[PDB]
A paper describes a structure:
Here, we characterize a key role for the [name] Binding Region (G2BR) of the ERAD accessory protein [name] ([name]) in ERAD pathways. The G2BRAUP1 shares significant structural conservation with the G2BR found in the E3 ubiquitin ligase gp78 and in vitro can similarly allosterically activate ubiquitination in conjunction with ERAD E3s.
The structure of the [name] G2BR (G2BRAUP1) in complex with [name] reveals an interface that includes a network of salt bridges, hydrogen bonds, and hydrophobic interactions essential for [name] function in cells. The overall structure exhibits a high degree of similarity to the previously described structure of [name]:G2BRgp78 with a root–mean–square deviation (RMSD) of 0.5 Å for 167 out of 182 pairs of Cα atoms. Specifically, five positively charged or polar residues of the G2BRAUP1—R382, Q383, K390, R398, and R400—form salt bridges or hydrogen bonds with negatively charged or polar groups on [name]. Mutation of all five of the positively charged or polar G2BRAUP1 residues to glutamate (5E), however, led to a loss of detectable [name] binding. While the Y394D mutation alone reduced binding, mutation of L386 and Y394 together eliminated detectable binding to [name]. Binding was similarly lost with a single point mutation, A397D, which makes multiple hydrophobic contacts with [name]. The low nanomolar affinity of G2BRAUP1 for [name] is driven by a combination of salt bridges, hydrogen bonds, and hydrophobic interactions distributed along the length of the [name]:G2BRAUP1 interface as revealed by the crystal structure.
Numbering used by the authors:
A (entry chain B): 377 to 404
B (entry chain A): 2 to 96, 107 to 165
């Protein structure tokens, strides 16, 4: 929507990629 | 807004609407579209799988006439990345396929993902990594996994 929401969404997507990768890297 | 700014805004919107797999990219702050951070995940089933590698992309004033510079801010071990993190790839060299009107941020990032997936051997920005890739691949894969762990803080 606005700049600030795009920025918060971007930072959330970065956090989510780390959380996703850590799960995949440590699974099985 | 000038030509570079309009183009960078357009590319950001397109990347956000059509995100590449395992890539989160955009300006670090929209008050300065000339400095971006891109997080790139090592692709599954490759030697850097599930690494998360942050890079700074710094754009010239005359973009898209000239290419950005790109440097990783995490440790890397790769033939085409200098020890200081600077990325050495043909797409980022001014006129293999070099910077041209066809190119874009999305194509830069995809080219870096590809070079992670399949480390190549023309450039020798990291000669130790070039040599280990060539001659001691099993040992390369062991260091790659360490680079992955470090990128995750684990």
């Amino acid at each position: 929507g606005p700049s600030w929401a795009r920025q918060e969404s971007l930072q959330e997507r970065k956090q989510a990629l780390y959380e996703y990768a850590r799960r995949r890297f440590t699974e099985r | 807004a000038g030509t570079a700014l309009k183009r960078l805004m357009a590319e950001y919107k397109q990347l956000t609407l059509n995100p590449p797999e395992g890539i989160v990219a955009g300006p670090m702050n929209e008050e300065n579209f000339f400095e971006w951070e891109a997080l790139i995940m090592g692709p599954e089933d490759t030697c850097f799988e599930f690494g998360v590698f942050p890079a700074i992309l710094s754009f010239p004033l005359d973009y898209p006439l000239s290419p950005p510079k790109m440097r990783f801010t995490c440790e890397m071990f790769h033939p085409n990345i200098y020890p200081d993190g600077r990325v050495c790839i043909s797409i980022l060299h001014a006129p293999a396929e070099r910077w041209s009107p066809v190119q874009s941020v999305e194509k830069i990032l995809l080219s870096v993902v590809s070079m992670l997936a399949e480390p190549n051997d023309e450039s020798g920005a990291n000669v130790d990594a070039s040599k280990m890739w060539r001659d001691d691949r099993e040992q390369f894969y062991k260091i790659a996994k360490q680079i992955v762990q470090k990128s995750l803080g684990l």
